Design a binder for this molecule. Structure first.
Ligand SMILES: CC(C)=CCC[C@@H](C)[C@H]1CC[C@H]2C3=C(CC[C@]12C)[C@@]1(C)CC[C@H](O)[C@@](C)(C(=O)O)[C@@H]1CC3
Ligand SMILES: CC(C)=CCC[C@@H](C)[C@H]1CC[C@H]2C3=C(CC[C@]12C)[C@@]1(C)CC[C@H](O)[C@@](C)(C(=O)O)[C@@H]1CC3
Ligand SMILES: CC(C)=CCC[C@@H](C)[C@H]1CC[C@H]2C3=C(CC[C@]12C)[C@@]1(C)CC[C@H](O)[C@@](C)(C(=O)O)[C@@H]1CC3
Ligand SMILES: CC(C)=CCC[C@@H](C)[C@H]1CC[C@H]2C3=C(CC[C@]12C)[C@@]1(C)CC[C@H](O)[C@@](C)(C(=O)O)[C@@H]1CC3
Ligand SMILES: CC(C)=CCC[C@@H](C)[C@H]1CC[C@H]2C3=C(CC[C@]12C)[C@@]1(C)CC[C@H](O)[C@@](C)(C(=O)O)[C@@H]1CC3
Ligand SMILES: CC(C)=CCC[C@@H](C)[C@H]1CC[C@H]2C3=C(CC[C@]12C)[C@@]1(C)CC[C@H](O)[C@@](C)(C(=O)O)[C@@H]1CC3
Lengths: 245, 9, 245, 245, 9, 245, 245, 245, 9, 9, 9, 9
């Protein structure tokens, strides 16, 4: 060792804490409600809702989580110390990525159900969206993640790396991000070895898997932003509009 | 700007 | 691992700190005075004191320690978060148990002497109590504990588990205690393995050993509370009276 | 284990932090400027300066670092708790020792250059001092240290032990220092084993090596304090004068 | 109650 | 530490090896055939077999495994060094216990199927036995074990402790077994902490759970040994007859 | 953990031993001769040798090392258990790769010299080869490796993975290699975390870097095999001819 | 790490095994007989024996142990690989040193008794020797060692270092011993950190403490070799005579 | 006895 | 005294 | 074949 | 020599 161990196991604690505070839903509560499923009747009610409702509905629920991700970023060690521009670039292109990762906690894999609006629901509540291929791609993603059996610490560190990405275009102080990214990579790897969990590094999904999903989302949005342009202009939360233009 | 507001720019 | 290591080694630190602050006597001071013994003359002075003095005397010294145990409880992680009722039930039935454990620090096993009123004294200062069998049972208990050579961290974690006991009757939110107890069990076990001290888990005295002692105490009290009812009503500290009715 | 692990790995963190805050120059900045060398012209400018300038110059740069060492001491765990006299004795005889150790961070060993006044310079900037043997002895010392490839944590703990020395004469509460020194020795050794860096304990330079250097410095000073007595009286920083009389 | 006082009930 | 670490992590290796050699079926082969199930037709064929066939059939398959358990015992460190009598007592009362533990490797919990005669079959192949309550009790047992996700090392060490039991009646050199049992307990516990798997110690099934099953087996046998006494006398393998009289 | 730790830290020992026995030159001997350099006169003697000598010379020295690599393979755990065809495919395409890795031990980076024919020589002994670009590419490769400061254990495990590559074309039982490769990947990664050396995994050179070098070698050979076809047919060692056709 | 961990934890095992095989008395047997003391009558019988008997007696018992130490040396890793001369020098000057260390296992510190001729006896069985100051010095030495609570592994490694000493005069291949000594120092230190027993390194007795004892022995021998020269010539075992001339 | 045989008694 | 000042004596 | 010989094919 | 014998010199 040449790097300060005290400094790196400080970062591990800092990241895990910043996530712990901005974890939105506490896990024990997310788990105990896994026996709280949408009835066959309730599900039908969702899929016979209108596309411009299910979009407006989800776009609010999404922006709900995204807000917490922003808080995570702010409390993240050495994130604010970055340039104001870079600070935006990472959050804008990365916030949606983080949420998709966080979903695996609200996703039970035994029944392939996500915790949506109070209860667990299947892939087909979101039938009314018209982008039911992207939904399947999302559920498949959260399945692979749920298969890895992440700890809450590993979620904390993984999502941290998801946000801090120097390979994101538009970065002014790129070299500044590279350094921060590396220390977080070191911290993640150290914690995995501290816990014999090094095996999952290869099991992690490719960097392009979330590149696909997040862009596939903004693709189906531009469709909706054209079908119901006045709806997204008047109803959709501004933060959502700002991020997904 | 809203994102800028959320941070403090 | 699936549980958050950062969360569990946080608890280990939290418990050890809460004890460290409410340790009453600091250990180095408790040790250096082991060459400070009651003379043969002094001892006789104690055993020719009156039963209603030696009881009133000890009942104050006991309530002195018990007060510190209450502080330990308050500073204990997630103790206050429990129900107000349960909070009382655990403390009432458990405070006396903790003190008996803490005594092993003020008990030198080479000479079988306890640190009482400034100096180390034998089993027979407490001859004047009339319950000289319970005293022997107590000294034997603290001997077995002293034989294990606890660390101050292990005392901190052991006593924590002694207090947090979901097997105590009268608990409203019992399931709440079970969860807290388990995390403390995990934290204790983790720290023992971190220090190769796992061996002592089997060496620990049974849960009923302290059930015996604490009840054996309140048994001999009811005798005294009947022999000298007016003494305990007027002299004995209220907190003692409240706990041992 | 019998000592509290939580207490000892707390000290390790406390020491590393107190150094981290009083590290004067941050290391990454000290490293990136290793390609910033004094030109052949610049060097000549230094060695044709007057002895009473190069002494007055360095004596200010030295007192600059020494001030930071004093801050390190104040923030050092359990240093202030020592006697006021002892507090002075350790700092006075030890501050110069610490600085010599800290120099190895500002010393590149590939070219044998020290970071002096904005750039890296060789052994011969200090030719104008007249004590060019002591300078060589110093550079040789920082070379051996640089050869060990210290971590920033190991610097933090080593320098801590350098300051806390119960073998220093003039100590009132010597036994008090011995105890503090030991806990720091334990903490250092624990951290080295935590990091497989135990090998360096034998590689460390003898306690007399710095005894030589620091006294060899005050020896060449008394020469200068006699050659230019009015210069040191009027120009040399008071803290320097106080420490090296 | 004294115990309740010591805690804050 | 006071016990020889080298000696205890030698035992851990010795036990794991002795099991590895007598593991009967290699695990990777046991797993890849989990997609090899008995058809609805095949199952019916089993349950319409005669009780005296299904008993004679299983009693041979059981004695097949029991033979491997005997080899495990012989290769087990310090088992042969025990008294010849004790050597028999442990094996006789314990061999059946070990097999029940080993079954959890041939038991898939997703479908509640055991690997029987080339394919995986449900609880109801053994309907023809007449003791279909014991079968359910067995499948429930192997489910709880399968829920713990044992390593092959943990199986090796657990089964070792199952066999080495000083609480078994009829032991001559009981104190000799106690000592061997303890070293194996230490070795097991050490390996669990080496792998952060200490959590499972409390998750392990009670000592009486297998006391129930093994005796429940010999109970239903005495029924069959009375219904078809001539069958068990002529067909049942001698080793089976010897162990279950 | 679910994989057998005892099994994986057995493999780590097995690989390190198989290398230790087939390490050709022992390291301490390779190091002490680093002050044994070719004189300016000697070097000229090498570069004025004929191309058909320097090729015939090196092709023998290369086949010398390659023979040891074959022994390493044979003693490698679970290599012989592979198919005879696959056994050849891995060795043929991989032996040259391993040697290039092993060279970093006979390469001093302070002076950029390789241990050739008794002494250390620079990049320009091999001027007479005509492929002096490949030589530079090789020296650059061994420099990067020498920069990582491998342990002898890490060389043992790295080279093992270099040989065991399921991405090599012509493999019959490819799935068999994938499994062996993975266990070796796990073993390597485990040992790196055991030694806090996980950092080097990212520092390792790409899989194509050696693909370049080994093919770049066989490319310049076909040139020589055409310029001096009768030389390679009569002088070049058969094993070399067999591998590089 | 740069040294091969696999190589160093191999040495740790090799040394511990070589001692384990040549441990003379097994420890559990040495401990259980601690309640087997010489009666007041028996002791008197020893001290009224003649000086030339008690010397001849002990000189045989000593040579008994020394023979085992020689076996330890032979089985010690890389001891035989040393020069034949050096091999003798280390054994001759070091065998007596090792035995004095091994005595701490046969020395109970609660009663200050050594296991001599079947039972535990005090310092005063050896009154008849006339060198009753050396005896006291020896008992004091084994007390300090017994105070450290060595493991059997730590005895194995300590005694190894006691024998392998390059500071012994008369060494031909001294540099060869230095290298072997260092690897053993590394192995010892590694094992202590593996077991959190690093604390004892400073607690170990100085190298001169055994220099004193062993020479103090040969000093009192020359007295006896002059008082009863014909006794030592005819009775004393040749190996003893050879070592202590 | 068969069990005794399997061991070596 | 300056050193005493820097500490707080 | 020489490589086959070195192994044992 | 006896010591030499014990080793093998
Ligand atoms: C067009 C669009 C937006 C399609 C996406 C539709 C779907 C996939 C999308 C719309 C709403 C959104 C959602 C989550 C992520 C994906 C999902 C379900 C999760 C589960 C992430 C974790 C948060 O903690 C938690 C629980 C919360 O907000 O509390 C939410 C609950 C709501
Ligand atoms: C009828 C009764 C009450 C019988 C009990 C009599 C005896 C056993 C009982 C009466 C007084 C009590 C006592 C302690 C526990 C048992 C004991 C001695 C200890 C040592 C625990 C640790 C505290 O830190 C410390 C040092 C303190 O108060 O500072 C006390 C000192 C006084
Ligand atoms: C007569 C005398 C005083 C002779 C000493 C002359 C020489 C050896 C001496 C005079 C000035 C002094 C010096 C340092 C230590 C030795 C040295 C160079 C270092 C490098 C230590 C680390 C500090 O962080 C740093 C960078 C700083 O002040 O920022 C300084 C920079 C200035
Ligand atoms: C009356 C009786 C005997 C009732 C018991 C009936 C049932 C429960 C019982 C009869 C046959 C028996 C059996 C096993 C244990 C329980 C079970 C199924 C297992 C799976 C243990 C692991 C061995 O490795 C393996 C695979 C083998 O023999 O290879 C066997 C396969 C056959
Ligand atoms: C056309 C060709 C073959 C060009 C390659 C020329 C050059 C690069 C090539 C020709 C000879 C060859 C060589 C080695 C690898 C590369 C190198 C130098 C090393 C150093 C590897 C480690 C072995 O342990 C050691 C020491 C040995 O054989 O003992 C050899 C010594 C000889
Ligand atoms: C003049 C002389 C020789 C004075 C020495 C007298 C005394 C100190 C000396 C004479 C006999 C000798 C002795 C031992 C070391 C010191 C001691 C007692 C020990 C205990 C070491 C460990 C061996 O395992 C063990 C048990 C054995 O031989 O089995 C012996 C038993 C006999």
């Amino acid at each position: 060792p040449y790097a300060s161990l005290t400094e790196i196991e400080h970062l591990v604690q800092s990241v895990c804490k910043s996530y712990r505070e901005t974890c939105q839903l506490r896990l024990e509560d997310l788990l105990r409600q896994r026996s709280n499923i949408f009835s066959r009747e309730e599900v039908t009610g969702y899929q016979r809702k209108s596309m411009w409702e299910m979009w407006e509905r989800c776009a609010h629920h999404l922006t709900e989580a995204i807000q917490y991700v922003v808080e995570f970023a702010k409390r993240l060690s050495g994130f604010m110390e970055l340039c104001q521009n870079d600070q935006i670039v990472l959050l804008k292109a990365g916030a949606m990525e983080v949420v998709l990762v966080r979903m695996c906690r609200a996703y039970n894999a035994d029944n392939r159900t996500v915790f949506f609006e109070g209860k667990y629901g299947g892939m087909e509540l979101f039938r009314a969206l018209g982008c039911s291929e992207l939904i399947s791609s999302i559920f498949d993603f959260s399945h692979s993640l749920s298969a890895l059996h992440f700890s809450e610490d590993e979620i904390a560190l993984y999502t941290a790396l998801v946000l801090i990405n120097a390979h994101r275009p538009g970065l002014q102080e790129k070299r500044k991000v590279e350094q921060l990214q590396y220390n977080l990579e070191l911290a993640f790897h150290h914690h995995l070895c501290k816990t014999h969990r090094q095996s999952i590094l290869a099991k992690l999904p490719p960097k392009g898997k979330l590149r696909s999903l997040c862009s596939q989302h903004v693709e189906r949005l531009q469709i909706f932003q054209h079908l119901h342009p006045i709806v997204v202009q008047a109803a959709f939360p501004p933060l959502y509009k700002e991020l997904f233009s | 700007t809203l994102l800028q507001l959320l941070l403090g720019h």
